Amino acid sequence: MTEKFDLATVYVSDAKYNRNIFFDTSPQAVKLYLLYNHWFMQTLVYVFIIINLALALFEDPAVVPLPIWATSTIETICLSAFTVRIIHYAKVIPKDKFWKDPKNICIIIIVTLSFIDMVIYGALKATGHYGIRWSRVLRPLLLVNVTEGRQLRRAFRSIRNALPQISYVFFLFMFSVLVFSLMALKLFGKRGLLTINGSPYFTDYMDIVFDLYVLVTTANSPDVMMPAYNSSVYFTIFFILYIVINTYTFMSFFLAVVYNNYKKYLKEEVRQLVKAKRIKMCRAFSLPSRFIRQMVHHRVFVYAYDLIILVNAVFIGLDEENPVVSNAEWGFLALYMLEILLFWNWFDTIIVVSALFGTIINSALKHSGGYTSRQVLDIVFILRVLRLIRVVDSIKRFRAIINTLIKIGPTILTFGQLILVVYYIFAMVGMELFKGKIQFFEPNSTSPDREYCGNPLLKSTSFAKLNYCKNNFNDVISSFILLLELTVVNQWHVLTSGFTAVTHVSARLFFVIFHIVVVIIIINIFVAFILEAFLVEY
Amino acid sequence: MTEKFDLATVYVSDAKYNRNIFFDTSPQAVKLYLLYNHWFMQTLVYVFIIINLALALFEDPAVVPLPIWATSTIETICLSAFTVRIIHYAKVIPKDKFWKDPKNICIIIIVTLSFIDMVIYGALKATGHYGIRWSRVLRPLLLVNVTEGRQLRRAFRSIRNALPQISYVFFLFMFSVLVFSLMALKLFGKRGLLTINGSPYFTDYMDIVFDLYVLVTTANSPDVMMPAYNSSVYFTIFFILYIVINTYTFMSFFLAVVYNNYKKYLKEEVRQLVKAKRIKMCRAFSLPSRFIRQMVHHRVFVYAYDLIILVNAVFIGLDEENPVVSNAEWGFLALYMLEILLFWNWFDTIIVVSALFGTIINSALKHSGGYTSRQVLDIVFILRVLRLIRVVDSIKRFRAIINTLIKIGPTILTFGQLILVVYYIFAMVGMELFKGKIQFFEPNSTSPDREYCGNPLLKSTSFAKLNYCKNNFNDVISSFILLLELTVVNQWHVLTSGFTAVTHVSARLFFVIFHIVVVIIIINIFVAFILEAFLVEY
Ligand code: NA
């Protein structure tokens, strides 16, 4: 009636959410909900999470060194924003189900732990303990256990359900690796002959099992077997079997398990949100020449601009800065500018107006200071070749991608932050162990400081003399890059062998665990998506 | 009646086949069918195909050099066996549908071409033409287009149907690679600065597109970007985008397409064989102490032998040939031998009797000639650690694998020869281009013959000084090994860079095409199986 109508609106206006609220009895206790779910607070909590995360750019290893008093008073207001949001949520939900939700317990827990760690990082006269801030790994868990993370903490239950099977299979896989390592130890071994390059080939077991594990990841496929294939071809059979048993059978059994669990949780996000919709949504019931320019387009006219684009991609990859081509970049700019004579019309318009910034080239190269020569060209040419993507219209296959790019569809946003929660936890953990062991040195630097590697323990390794030096964990920027080239598994064993040469050999576990959680059950949860999105879309 | 009963039997006795026969009118024209489909002829044609294939061990580059008159009179009888089988088949099927089948046209075609090439390899006074035998690539096509290859030539129609989609997607993928290569050429480029190691980084386009293609295959993930990440971190964004667009999105779109087509052809092998069954099958209608040893087993007794096995895997990986352990290998042999006091009982019995060949160790080490010391141990120890696989019973998960290993189930046999048809076609093609360019040299050989690489064009490359020398195409054995480490894609660009350094740079197409057909649409057709076999098995 006079106020139940509003309760009805707030029950119906969520044709997408999934939760229970306080059914209004005090007329401000539903206004507090309407303010809670209000888009601006929903984006304010996310920008406050992003500030809290990106605080890692400044703190212990910093790309921008900021004083501790200054990078603590930022996450003090971040944690205060989370506290004010959680007490406001408690003012929305009655004090019956607020206390039971794990999400709320976890939120107040990680806020309390971050706030206690922040002040116990009151160093107390430089008692720096050579590594602190054990709560930075809890920062990306706000991204999950926040009230708006229903799209993520649901996608975390999908993995929580996959573990009694992923581990069920990984036990068999690690047993295969361990029995194959025993088989290879009784083969070429301490009771064997051959070497690799000044090293004994397969002599100790704990190095065999790692060299055989990394062969599953095929980071060293033709090199781990090149001795003992230089010795006898019959040794090859061992690796032929190992690869087809582990690299292809097991590493695809993990994908099968991950895809099965994803496919099984998709029908329990839907059909459990659908029932979570009709609960409330149904409860509301109980609660001249101008004619010519108009007709040229719907003709052979896109074929004229699919050729002008094509001849434009030939006027790009031939530049030697001759008047033939240095002026022609202006003509093509005008040709698309008439396309302003009425998906792509959204994208196409963005590029042409951004390409009209070739005037900046005129106003910043021949005069007015040419100090920004390479930078502005590397941003206009990366933009001209972006026009080229619309030449794909000639195949009639990109007006049908905005459906595969369906409206915003936070699924690709959910994974985009799922890879962040994992990277941030490993970057934070990683950069406290290998904080400043190796370091990229400028090409003209103090060579007597051992500039060819960073520190003499990489005196002659395959990490040095391969220019891997900007892969250090010395800051969250160059530590997120490293975790990429660790994700894409090429030569992850030599990146590992550069961090187990400056630290103990046990650091091998940090990168093995990383590969297990990222490449086996995070990249596969990605392939499981663009597999599911491809088959069941009809 | 008097003979229709036999026609009825031969129509019913095939509860698994799919074909039409001659309905008997001349009483020998169905006896010829019964003899045709007779198991012995069916295995004789396959051993004759295997002889014809394995003839490559002897012919042009040989592991065993056999005279041309002698390795031609073997495939003369092989082609005669195929001719006698095809004329016998023509004597089975009436001369109406025999001539129309492609399979028959293709069989007589490849037989005629092999037989013409075999005699035109009547060299005519050493006119060797530096490479002949253009019909060896047709040898593995008998494996497909033979009458018993219905399990394979059907699995080839699955790929023939996937091509209008795999190419549909590969066009977009190669366009992405080509536009990204243009974007990287206008980036760090001839109008750029940086180098790699004495080389210019990304200057010419046809090398950028290959270095960017191989980055999709992630064979050079952290090395292709290490310069221009040693120059500016903002260049990383380019590769971060390239990898997530190509390495993970496209390379999984290929898997999605392959798996969709496999899943779509599975329901057209079944439900088209099922209708191919009820056609004929229904047409038949119209046409004391002994008590103790008996009861110890069904008790805690497998737990006693799951521990004896466990302590046996500790009595294996500690051997230093002491009397403690050199005798203990006999005791464990006896312990399992009592397990002969009544899936595994099949497998377990095989290992224990094969492990009783430790008597050969006694009769061939301490006396009677110890010239076979390493060889017989490397075959008994690879066998003891095979006992260990039954310790998996303690998890209760391998009596349920003989269902995933269902009765013979030629599907895993169909793929096992599908990888052979592809390898044999590339080994035959490959070993006629790079026949003897590089060659593995023994560790004590004529160094002045350029033994560190094989030939001076690999003077200082990453193919030499990495011990890649037994990867040559110099014989079908070491050419099938190479195509494995080409299949498992680690460092396929440096194996390529060793063959494009002895031949023209255009040889890059042989390995790019190989990766496209093996890693993209053959390994994915394998993952599509153990994905399909895992989900739809209920
Ligand atoms: Na790789």
Tab-separated table of N, CA and C in Angstrom, chain B residues 3-102:
chain	number	residue	atom	x	y	z
B	3	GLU	N	20.038	-72.131	-48.591
B	3	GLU	CA	21.198	-71.249	-48.621
B	3	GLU	C	20.893	-69.833	-48.162
B	4	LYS	N	19.623	-69.437	-48.077
B	4	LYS	CA	19.288	-68.120	-47.551
B	4	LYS	C	19.631	-68.027	-46.073
B	5	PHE	N	19.558	-69.152	-45.360
B	5	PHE	CA	20.013	-69.171	-43.978
B	5	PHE	C	21.433	-68.647	-43.850
B	6	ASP	N	22.323	-69.012	-44.776
B	6	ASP	CA	23.705	-68.550	-44.713
B	6	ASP	C	23.810	-67.059	-44.999
B	7	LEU	N	23.081	-66.583	-46.010
B	7	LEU	CA	22.950	-65.147	-46.218
B	7	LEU	C	22.445	-64.460	-44.956
B	8	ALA	N	21.482	-65.077	-44.274
B	8	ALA	CA	20.992	-64.500	-43.032
B	8	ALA	C	22.079	-64.446	-41.970
B	9	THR	N	22.873	-65.509	-41.836
B	9	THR	CA	23.960	-65.486	-40.862
B	9	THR	C	24.949	-64.379	-41.174
B	10	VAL	N	25.328	-64.238	-42.443
B	10	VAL	CA	26.337	-63.238	-42.775
B	10	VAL	C	25.744	-61.838	-42.696
B	11	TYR	N	24.413	-61.724	-42.655
B	11	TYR	CA	23.804	-60.419	-42.413
B	11	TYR	C	23.684	-60.127	-40.925
B	12	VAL	N	23.566	-61.163	-40.106
B	12	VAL	CA	23.380	-60.980	-38.671
B	12	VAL	C	24.721	-61.021	-37.952
B	13	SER	N	25.631	-61.876	-38.418
B	13	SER	CA	26.895	-62.083	-37.720
B	13	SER	C	27.733	-60.813	-37.669
B	14	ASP	N	27.326	-59.787	-38.405
B	14	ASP	CA	27.957	-58.475	-38.329
B	14	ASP	C	27.049	-57.572	-37.501
B	15	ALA	N	27.171	-57.701	-36.183
B	15	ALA	CA	26.573	-56.772	-35.243
B	15	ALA	C	27.457	-55.560	-35.006
B	16	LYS	N	28.530	-55.417	-35.782
B	16	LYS	CA	29.462	-54.308	-35.623
B	16	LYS	C	29.845	-53.622	-36.923
B	17	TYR	N	29.694	-54.263	-38.078
B	17	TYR	CA	30.172	-53.712	-39.335
B	17	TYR	C	29.204	-52.669	-39.884
B	18	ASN	N	29.556	-52.136	-41.054
B	18	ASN	CA	28.708	-51.186	-41.774
B	18	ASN	C	29.118	-51.247	-43.246
B	19	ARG	N	28.317	-51.951	-44.042
B	19	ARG	CA	28.527	-52.053	-45.480
B	19	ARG	C	27.384	-52.860	-46.072
B	20	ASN	N	27.342	-52.896	-47.398
B	20	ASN	CA	26.458	-53.799	-48.119
B	20	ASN	C	27.294	-54.810	-48.889
B	21	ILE	N	26.763	-56.019	-49.021
B	21	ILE	CA	27.478	-57.107	-49.670
B	21	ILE	C	26.681	-57.525	-50.892
B	22	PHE	N	27.182	-58.504	-51.628
B	22	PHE	CA	26.365	-59.165	-52.632
B	22	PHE	C	25.483	-60.196	-51.947
B	23	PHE	N	24.171	-59.981	-51.981
B	23	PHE	CA	23.248	-61.018	-51.542
B	23	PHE	C	23.438	-62.246	-52.422
B	24	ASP	N	23.694	-63.388	-51.796
B	24	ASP	CA	24.169	-64.552	-52.533
B	24	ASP	C	23.173	-64.988	-53.598
B	25	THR	N	23.672	-65.159	-54.819
B	25	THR	CA	22.968	-65.872	-55.877
B	25	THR	C	23.804	-67.014	-56.427
B	26	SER	N	25.108	-66.797	-56.608
B	26	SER	CA	26.032	-67.868	-56.930
B	26	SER	C	26.686	-68.345	-55.647
B	27	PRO	N	26.491	-69.609	-55.250
B	27	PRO	CA	26.825	-70.027	-53.874
B	27	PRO	C	28.268	-69.783	-53.462
B	28	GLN	N	29.164	-69.455	-54.391
B	28	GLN	CA	30.533	-69.129	-54.015
B	28	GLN	C	30.739	-67.634	-53.809
B	29	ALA	N	29.799	-66.800	-54.261
B	29	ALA	CA	29.938	-65.354	-54.171
B	29	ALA	C	29.541	-64.804	-52.807
B	30	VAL	N	29.284	-65.670	-51.831
B	30	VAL	CA	29.108	-65.222	-50.458
B	30	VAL	C	30.150	-65.947	-49.622
B	31	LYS	N	30.565	-67.123	-50.089
B	31	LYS	CA	31.733	-67.762	-49.501
B	31	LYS	C	32.956	-66.877	-49.676
B	32	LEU	N	33.045	-66.192	-50.818
B	32	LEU	CA	34.145	-65.260	-51.033
B	32	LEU	C	34.075	-64.091	-50.063
B	33	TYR	N	32.869	-63.697	-49.657
B	33	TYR	CA	32.756	-62.655	-48.642
B	33	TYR	C	33.182	-63.176	-47.281
B	34	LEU	N	32.679	-64.351	-46.905
B	34	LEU	CA	33.027	-64.939	-45.617
B	34	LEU	C	34.532	-65.125	-45.501
B	35	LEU	N	35.177	-65.481	-46.613
B	35	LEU	CA	36.631	-65.556	-46.640
B	35	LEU	C	37.248	-64.167	-46.605
B	36	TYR	N	36.594	-63.195	-47.238
B	36	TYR	CA	37.119	-61.836	-47.257
B	36	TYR	C	37.177	-61.257	-45.855
B	37	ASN	N	36.034	-61.188	-45.185
B	37	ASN	CA	35.989	-60.638	-43.842
B	37	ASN	C	36.609	-61.555	-42.800
B	38	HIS	N	37.126	-62.716	-43.199
B	38	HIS	CA	37.742	-63.637	-42.253
B	38	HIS	C	38.925	-62.979	-41.565
B	39	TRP	N	38.963	-63.070	-40.239
B	39	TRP	CA	39.940	-62.383	-39.403
B	39	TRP	C	41.366	-62.474	-39.927
B	40	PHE	N	41.737	-63.615	-40.504
B	40	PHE	CA	43.124	-63.785	-40.913
B	40	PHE	C	43.463	-62.906	-42.104
B	41	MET	N	42.574	-62.824	-43.094
B	41	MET	CA	42.810	-61.890	-44.188
B	41	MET	C	42.778	-60.448	-43.713
B	42	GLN	N	41.922	-60.141	-42.742
B	42	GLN	CA	41.842	-58.789	-42.212
B	42	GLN	C	43.133	-58.390	-41.508
B	43	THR	N	43.805	-59.337	-40.854
B	43	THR	CA	45.075	-58.998	-40.216
B	43	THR	C	46.235	-59.133	-41.193
B	44	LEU	N	46.071	-59.941	-42.237
B	44	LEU	CA	47.100	-60.061	-43.253
B	44	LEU	C	47.223	-58.794	-44.076
B	45	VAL	N	46.104	-58.165	-44.427
B	45	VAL	CA	46.201	-56.885	-45.115
B	45	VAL	C	46.846	-55.829	-44.231
B	46	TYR	N	46.630	-55.873	-42.917
B	46	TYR	CA	47.241	-54.864	-42.064
B	46	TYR	C	48.727	-55.118	-41.868
B	47	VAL	N	49.140	-56.378	-41.751
B	47	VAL	CA	50.576	-56.624	-41.686
B	47	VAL	C	51.242	-56.327	-43.019
B	48	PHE	N	50.532	-56.463	-44.135
B	48	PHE	CA	51.092	-56.054	-45.413
B	48	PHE	C	51.163	-54.546	-45.568
B	49	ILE	N	50.246	-53.806	-44.950
B	49	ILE	CA	50.383	-52.356	-44.908
B	49	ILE	C	51.555	-51.962	-44.024
B	50	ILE	N	51.739	-52.662	-42.906
B	50	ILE	CA	52.822	-52.324	-41.992
B	50	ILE	C	54.170	-52.637	-42.622
B	51	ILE	N	54.270	-53.745	-43.354
B	51	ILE	CA	55.503	-54.023	-44.082
B	51	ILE	C	55.781	-52.914	-45.082
B	52	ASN	N	54.754	-52.489	-45.815
B	52	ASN	CA	54.936	-51.451	-46.819
B	52	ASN	C	55.387	-50.145	-46.187
B	53	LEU	N	54.824	-49.800	-45.032
B	53	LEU	CA	55.243	-48.586	-44.341
B	53	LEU	C	56.661	-48.720	-43.812
B	54	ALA	N	56.906	-49.716	-42.968
B	54	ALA	CA	58.206	-49.952	-42.366
B	54	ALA	C	59.277	-50.271	-43.384
B	55	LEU	N	58.924	-50.369	-44.660
B	55	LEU	CA	59.951	-50.385	-45.687
B	55	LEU	C	60.788	-49.117	-45.673
B	56	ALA	N	60.251	-48.018	-45.144
B	56	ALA	CA	60.997	-46.770	-45.068
B	56	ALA	C	62.217	-46.865	-44.172
B	57	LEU	N	62.319	-47.908	-43.349
B	57	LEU	CA	63.518	-48.106	-42.548
B	57	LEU	C	64.724	-48.423	-43.410
B	58	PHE	N	64.512	-48.820	-44.659
B	58	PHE	CA	65.598	-49.297	-45.493
B	58	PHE	C	65.848	-48.467	-46.740
B	59	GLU	N	64.918	-47.607	-47.153
B	59	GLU	CA	64.979	-47.233	-48.556
B	59	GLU	C	65.914	-46.086	-48.930
B	60	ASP	N	65.488	-44.830	-48.768
B	60	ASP	CA	66.370	-43.810	-49.331
B	60	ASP	C	67.368	-43.287	-48.298
B	61	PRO	N	66.929	-42.646	-47.183
B	61	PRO	CA	67.778	-42.617	-45.992
B	61	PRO	C	67.414	-43.777	-45.086
B	62	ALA	N	68.347	-44.677	-44.823
B	62	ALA	CA	68.018	-45.934	-44.178
B	62	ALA	C	68.674	-46.036	-42.816
B	63	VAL	N	67.936	-46.593	-41.855
B	63	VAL	CA	68.585	-47.087	-40.650
B	63	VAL	C	69.313	-48.385	-40.961
B	64	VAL	N	68.785	-49.168	-41.891
B	64	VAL	CA	69.421	-50.377	-42.391
B	64	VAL	C	69.450	-50.296	-43.910
B	65	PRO	N	70.586	-49.973	-44.497
B	65	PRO	CA	70.637	-49.815	-45.955
B	65	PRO	C	70.410	-51.120	-46.698
B	66	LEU	N	69.325	-51.190	-47.459
B	66	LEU	CA	68.964	-52.363	-48.232
B	66	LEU	C	68.961	-52.040	-49.719
B	67	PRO	N	69.496	-52.921	-50.558
B	67	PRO	CA	69.602	-52.610	-51.984
B	67	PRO	C	68.236	-52.364	-52.599
B	68	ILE	N	68.220	-51.479	-53.598
B	68	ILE	CA	66.962	-51.083	-54.212
B	68	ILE	C	66.234	-52.271	-54.825
B	69	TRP	N	66.960	-53.230	-55.400
B	69	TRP	CA	66.299	-54.416	-55.930
B	69	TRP	C	65.630	-55.219	-54.830
B	70	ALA	N	66.124	-55.112	-53.600
B	70	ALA	CA	65.606	-55.888	-52.483
B	70	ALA	C	64.512	-55.178	-51.715
B	71	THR	N	64.568	-53.856	-51.623
B	71	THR	CA	63.493	-53.096	-51.011
B	71	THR	C	62.448	-52.664	-52.021
B	72	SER	N	62.599	-53.065	-53.282
B	72	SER	CA	61.523	-52.962	-54.250
B	72	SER	C	60.753	-54.259	-54.404
B	73	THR	N	61.413	-55.406	-54.273
B	73	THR	CA	60.711	-56.677	-54.350
B	73	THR	C	59.967	-57.020	-53.070
B	74	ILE	N	60.038	-56.173	-52.047
B	74	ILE	CA	59.180	-56.360	-50.883
B	74	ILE	C	57.874	-55.607	-51.067
B	75	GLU	N	57.951	-54.350	-51.478
B	75	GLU	CA	56.741	-53.611	-51.775
B	75	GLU	C	56.139	-54.006	-53.107
B	76	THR	N	56.819	-54.838	-53.889
B	76	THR	CA	56.124	-55.446	-55.013
B	76	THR	C	55.137	-56.490	-54.525
B	77	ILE	N	55.539	-57.331	-53.568
B	77	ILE	CA	54.595	-58.281	-52.988
B	77	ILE	C	53.587	-57.601	-52.076
B	78	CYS	N	53.930	-56.465	-51.470
B	78	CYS	CA	52.927	-55.725	-50.711
B	78	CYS	C	51.843	-55.165	-51.626
B	79	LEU	N	52.243	-54.506	-52.712
B	79	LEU	CA	51.272	-54.012	-53.674
B	79	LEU	C	50.525	-55.140	-54.362
B	80	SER	N	51.154	-56.297	-54.556
B	80	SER	CA	50.432	-57.447	-55.072
B	80	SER	C	49.425	-57.994	-54.074
B	81	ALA	N	49.733	-57.962	-52.779
B	81	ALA	CA	48.738	-58.344	-51.786
B	81	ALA	C	47.555	-57.394	-51.817
B	82	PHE	N	47.814	-56.094	-51.933
B	82	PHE	CA	46.708	-55.147	-52.032
B	82	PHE	C	45.912	-55.329	-53.316
B	83	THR	N	46.583	-55.623	-54.427
B	83	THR	CA	45.878	-55.877	-55.679
B	83	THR	C	45.005	-57.120	-55.579
B	84	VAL	N	45.550	-58.211	-55.033
B	84	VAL	CA	44.788	-59.437	-54.848
B	84	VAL	C	43.638	-59.250	-53.878
B	85	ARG	N	43.793	-58.402	-52.873
B	85	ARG	CA	42.679	-58.096	-51.997
B	85	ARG	C	41.619	-57.246	-52.675
B	86	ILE	N	42.012	-56.304	-53.527
B	86	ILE	CA	41.031	-55.412	-54.135
B	86	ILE	C	40.268	-56.125	-55.248
B	87	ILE	N	40.934	-57.020	-55.983
B	87	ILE	CA	40.203	-57.782	-56.988
B	87	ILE	C	39.313	-58.816	-56.323
B	88	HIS	N	39.718	-59.334	-55.169
B	88	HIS	CA	38.847	-60.220	-54.414
B	88	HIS	C	37.630	-59.475	-53.879
B	89	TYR	N	37.829	-58.253	-53.386
B	89	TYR	CA	36.707	-57.412	-52.985
B	89	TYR	C	35.776	-57.126	-54.153
B	90	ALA	N	36.331	-56.821	-55.326
B	90	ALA	CA	35.511	-56.653	-56.517
B	90	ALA	C	34.769	-57.928	-56.878
B	91	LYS	N	35.340	-59.086	-56.567
B	91	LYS	CA	34.634	-60.346	-56.723
B	91	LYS	C	33.583	-60.558	-55.649
B	92	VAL	N	33.640	-59.800	-54.558
B	92	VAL	CA	32.590	-59.849	-53.542
B	92	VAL	C	31.443	-58.907	-53.887
B	93	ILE	N	31.734	-57.626	-54.087
B	93	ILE	CA	30.711	-56.628	-54.393
B	93	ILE	C	30.424	-56.641	-55.890
B	94	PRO	N	29.160	-56.638	-56.313
B	94	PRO	CA	28.868	-56.648	-57.752
B	94	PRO	C	29.437	-55.422	-58.443
B	95	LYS	N	29.558	-55.511	-59.768
B	95	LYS	CA	30.209	-54.443	-60.518
B	95	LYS	C	29.242	-53.294	-60.761
B	96	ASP	N	28.591	-52.831	-59.697
B	96	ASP	CA	27.752	-51.646	-59.738
B	96	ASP	C	28.198	-50.573	-58.765
B	97	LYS	N	28.422	-50.932	-57.504
B	97	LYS	CA	28.885	-49.995	-56.490
B	97	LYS	C	30.376	-50.112	-56.223
B	98	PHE	N	31.037	-51.115	-56.796
B	98	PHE	CA	32.481	-51.224	-56.631
B	98	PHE	C	33.191	-50.046	-57.277
B	99	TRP	N	32.639	-49.535	-58.375
B	99	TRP	CA	33.363	-48.557	-59.169
B	99	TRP	C	33.140	-47.124	-58.720
B	100	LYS	N	32.096	-46.948	-57.992
B	100	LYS	CA	31.794	-45.700	-57.534
B	100	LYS	C	32.422	-45.369	-56.260
B	101	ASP	N	32.793	-46.294	-55.423
B	101	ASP	CA	33.337	-45.907	-54.133
B	101	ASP	C	34.619	-45.184	-54.281
B	102	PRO	N	34.836	-44.139	-53.547
B	102	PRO	CA	36.056	-43.439	-53.632
B	102	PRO	C	37.046	-44.303	-53.117
